[PDB]
Design goal:
The structure is cut from a larger assembly and holds four copies of chain A and seven copies of chain C (154 residues). Chain A is mainly alpha-helical. Helix content of chain A is 37%, strand content 4%. Chain C has a seven-stranded antiparallel beta sheet with strand order 2-1-7-8-10-6-3. In chain C, strands 4-5 form a two-stranded antiparallel sheet. The chains are: A mainly alpha (135), C mainly beta (154). Chains C, E, F, G, H, I, K: This is Structural protein.
Chain lengths: 135, 135, 154, 66, 154, 154, 154, 154, 154, 68, 154
């Protein structure tokens, strides 16, 4: 938790090699490590004098980084939209369902998560040369 | 002392303008075309000397989201009761101000280190503002 | 959607009041009474090669206030005499105030910058005095203020 | 309310402060009876021990590791 | 060959929506609402004596967005107050969004660069605010995208 | 409010008298008789980075007085001869005086600066002589003077 | 890749504070307020014939801090009087501090090295005082410090 | 003969990558990012009276790498702190690498030679850091290599 | 924060009075009247290898006062005759005094150092006399004096 | 003794500056444009005399990689 | 205060008479006719460490008188022939006299120091002869003389 608590998901900063105080290096041999990896049981290993986590995998097989990013997006898009709506309805003139007012959600969402993610490198942009598609 | 100073000098400035204006003939008359000059008359003398010398505060407040700019309001002829046009006295002129403050007391918190200070955290992320978890 | 009237009252040029030193100006020109312009841009922009953008505010608020008067107006004499009075005594500053009818206003200090040319012809001539202003920030006099704390974002 | 000195200084030997960071608070579901509430927030192990938690107890170990 | 109608719907100026900070702008001028222009050329060309040609891309995307409003419009007060608020507090950036009716669109960050001059005359005046834009790339909002992978050659 | 007549008499161009050396000039052009312009601004402004403003007066009062005459007017010969007379003898200065009908006046020393071009065509030509003036301060000749001690403030 | 704003706030020249002896300086020039330059290079390089390279650090941190003020500013008198006061009494050192708005800062001891020339002309003059500094190391006041232990290599 | 395009891709300044110590530099100036110059000539020439010519190679490969950054860029703090860190600890060397977009590259060791002057003005300032390089030989990263064994003669 | 006027009066060049020997000088040039410069730096700095800094005051207060006059001015004759009178009799010193309008002043002894070159051309020429000064310390004539005992520190 | 010395003299220096600043009028005011001068005020007197006389340590630590 | 005319007559360049050997020179250049400059400063200053000041007069009055003539002027032949005549016979000195129109004059002995370069081009060329002068003291020819006994003091 101390190696995960204050890490902002917007950077997509995986846990691959993060050092953690307190833990003790895994002592098994190569076959034991292979078995542990096959069962998705992460192991703390010591290399070149230091200690390092490995592979940050979860039970279902998906990397923990992706799960954290998805939760971050899910929470903050909602918080941003609610904060805009509440401020807009606290002055009167609450939002109304019409084509002349709905499109502002584009700017509202492009602010907060969708742009912070691009600035911090979590969200990818550009043109793909292989598939010929844009991100 | 500041309140007494304002009270005396606003009155002296207004009286000095009125006397000079009525000493040439063309005394002031109760109409929308002549009343507004009181704004400039009052913004001269106290309201501006106070700002120049630092006694009167100006600017935008970041906490309450309010401005400290001095304000002056003058009523229109249509709002003056008929009785005052017989008494020939105007009322309800309003002014606002924000007073500055000196510094009286200060408290400090020092610290001393004897051994080698412990290594600081090596986090390079931009510090996030607040927790995302909120419903 | 129906067309909306942008105002309840009607913009009346006679309601625009100009007070120079505490007296109302009279005898204006035909088309335009006053024009207010800022000397310099509000914000400058520095663009790097890589694309980084940084901006710096501008603290130069000096401006020019054009003032058109008929050459037959009596206020030409007042300004002409005040020009020499200031030249001799050395005091050039005097308060300036403008009241808008259905627009912005202005209230700052100013001075006479240039005397307009004089031309005599078949028709009545015109003189366009230039009055400097210490600060050229047009201030509102409306219900504005409850929404400035709403547009704020980022 | 009343200050006897215009300027005062508290000389703390050795200790240093730390800045305020944004974070997600973890939750550790421990079993005990030290307080009636279902959930409490602590900022240091000193406060936990002051609440009757024994040194080396599960919650204390978790907090000092975190 | 027969003449073809370039569109099914009709270009309606009222359908063009401008959102500055999350609020719709109203009270536009007569002829032109908004003009968007890039500050610098997209690609530069270096021509040698022998005839060799080499080009370098330009990463300066700053632009200027003219905005015309009647001097009686209430939005003049909002922008005027925001100018001083930003000058004091130091925050000048705010989101800008434009929705086209039958053309391109725009969605970037912007700021107020210069306050337009004010003139009072016989008729209602006009004010042309200048709003900067971090990036002046007009983006489409149409079925375009299936042909961009066709024009490609060489 | 009722419209007010700005003057009692009527601006009569024939009442404008120009005395160059003690003789009245006659035979003027069609549209404009004389134009008076100052060479330099009255007051300069120095604006600091922090916003401090300081101003300095200008002591350069030289000006140019355009003078339009028909090429058939006899005064063309007088000025032409005086040009060579001054060139030979070395004396170029001569008094200049202008009397306004319902406007400002002028009374200073002047000299001939440039001779206008001459063109012959289907219609009668025009010549626009340029006369310098030592001081280009237009002085009033009205009841002005009792109010200059009123506008004063600050 | 999209263009990024290099800062959140805007560089405001008025926010740069200069404290000489415990008082804020006011009345700066137009273009540039202060310039700080080091007298000597940080590191010298000795190159041998065979190609061996060795370097030696430089311990001379003296620098010069240019300071531009309008000749009408009151701070000209303070510095002028302090010059003679130090000349007589023999004490020349005084603290110097500079606060950056969106850049580096400085806090060291300094002294007056040379008095600028004085010139009187049509416009307001300028004076560029030179203030010495014991150490000319510009120090940061930002989140910098967590990465200095990362760039380190070799 | 027809004009030929000297390259297939376009020179993109953003593609030029500078790695100082293992981190990418960002926040460059407007016109020029980096300039690399050799300190001494590659080959010297000795000419005798009779006309005999002999040459000697130069083994001094030290050079200077100018680096322009906006004063608002965060990398100013990193370099400033590293300067004092090296001054105290005594380690000044660190790897330097440059990747060209459509030109030559560089990969050697370097150090900070001189800190640029700091100036505060109306617009955002610029700082031109000077970074030394142990060897200033610009190396290619192209298909070059199959022709170097062809130009050889004599 | 609002812009402040740095002075109440206006800097008037005509108010600057120069008294050479007890008579007022007249007939100055166009742009600049007088320039005062010190010959040598006020304080020297000695920097040791280890970093120790020591300074020594400079007692050389000699300076040069440029003086621009039109070649038609009568004061050219006075100075020319005084030059030969001093050359013959041997007395060269005479009092010099300068009164500032909104700036510093000067009152010391001086002498004529160099006679300016003379050139005849299409326009009126200019002569820039150089007058030495025993002491070039510009003294104030303002309310300064109550704060000089405040800036003092260390 | 060092702690007591710092505690006394920082306070005395700050009070002496404040009293001199308020004895001419223009007393200190709580604003961002005047507060920062306390940095120079404190860097004068104790914080600098201690460095000059060797009581206060400075420099970069090579073990912990921290600055003093 | 009113502007004053510095002279009654007008500075006429044609009135400047140059007599070299008793004949008037003709065929001058466009901009400047003659320039007179002193070779050395009039008075030297010796400043001691303690501040004592002592001065010594300079007895070197040699000067250079530039003279511009069109390459088509006949006086080029006269000077060219006189150059060789003096070279052969050995006599180089000849009287030189200059009469000012509204300025100083000169009357001393002189000689030809350097022949100007000759260049042929699209337009008529110019030649700037240099004539030495035994004494370069510009003498007045005005009412000056009654005030030189007034400025004297100390």
């Amino acid at each position: 938790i101390g190696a995960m608590a204050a890490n902002d998901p917007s950077y997509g900063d995986s846990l691959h090699l993060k050092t953690m105080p307190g833990m003790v290096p895994f002592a098994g041999s190569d076959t034991q490590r292979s078995n542990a990896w096959s069962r998705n049981a992460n192991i703390y290993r010591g290399l070149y004098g230091g200690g390092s986590y490995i592979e940050g995998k979860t039970s279902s097989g998906q990397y923990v980084d992706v799960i954290r990013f998805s939760h971050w997006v899910k929470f903050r898009m909602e918080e941003s939209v609610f904060a805009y709506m509440k401020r807009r309805s606290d002055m009167g003139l609450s939002m109304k369902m019409s084509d002349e007012d709905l499109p502002v959600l584009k700017s509202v969402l492009m602010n907060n998560p969708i742009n912070i993610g691009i600035r911090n490198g979590g969200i990818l942009t550009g043109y793909d040369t292989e598939n010929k598609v844009s991100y | 002392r500041f309140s007494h100073w304002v009270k005396f000098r606003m009155e002296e400035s207004v009286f000095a303008y009125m006397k000079r204006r009525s000493d040439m003939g063309l005394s002031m008359k109760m109409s929308d075309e002549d009343l507004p000059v009181l704004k400039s008359v009052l913004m001269n003398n106290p309201i501006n000397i106070g700002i120049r010398n630092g006694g009167i505060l100006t600017g935008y407040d970041t906490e309450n989201k309010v401005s400290y700019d001095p304000t002056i309001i003058i009523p229109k002829r249509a709002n003056i009761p008929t009785n005052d046009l017989a008494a020939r006295i105007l009322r309800d002129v309003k002014v606002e101000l924000v007073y500055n403050n000196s510094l009286h007391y200060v408290k400090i918190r020092a610290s001393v280190v004897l051994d080698r200070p412990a290594g600081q955290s090596t986090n390079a992320q931009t510090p996030m503002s607040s927790s995302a978890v909120g419903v | 959607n129906q067309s909306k009237i942008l105002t309840l009252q009607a913009y009346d040029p006679a309601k625009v009041l100009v007070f120079i030193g505490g007296q109302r100006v009279s005898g204006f020109a035909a088309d335009t009474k006053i024009v207010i312009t800022r000397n310099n841009d509000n914000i400058s922009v520095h663009a790097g090669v890589d694309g980084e953008i940084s901006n710096a505010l501008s603290r130069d608020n000096t401006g020019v206030m054009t003032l058109s008067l008929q050459n037959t107006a009596k206020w030409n004499g007042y300004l002409a005499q005040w020009q020499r009075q200031a030249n001799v005594t050395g005091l050039i500053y005097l308060p300036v105030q403008v009241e808008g009818s259905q627009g912005l206003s202005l209230n700052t200090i100013g001075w006479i910058q240039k005397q307009p040319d004089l031309s005599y012809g078949t028709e009545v001539g015109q003189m366009d005095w230039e009055i400097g202003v210490l600060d050229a920030w047009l201030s509102p006099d409306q219900i504005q203020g409850i929404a400035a704390g709403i547009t704020g974002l980022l | 309310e009343y200050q006897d000195k215009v300027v005062d200084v508290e000389v703390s030997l050795g200790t240093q402060p730390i800045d305020t960071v944004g974070f997600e608070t973890p939750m550790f579901l421990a079993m005990h009876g030290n307080f009636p509430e279902r959930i409490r927030f602590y900022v240091s192990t000193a406060g936990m021990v002051a609440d009757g938690f024994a040194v080396g107890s599960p919650a204390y170990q978790f907090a000092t590791n975190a």
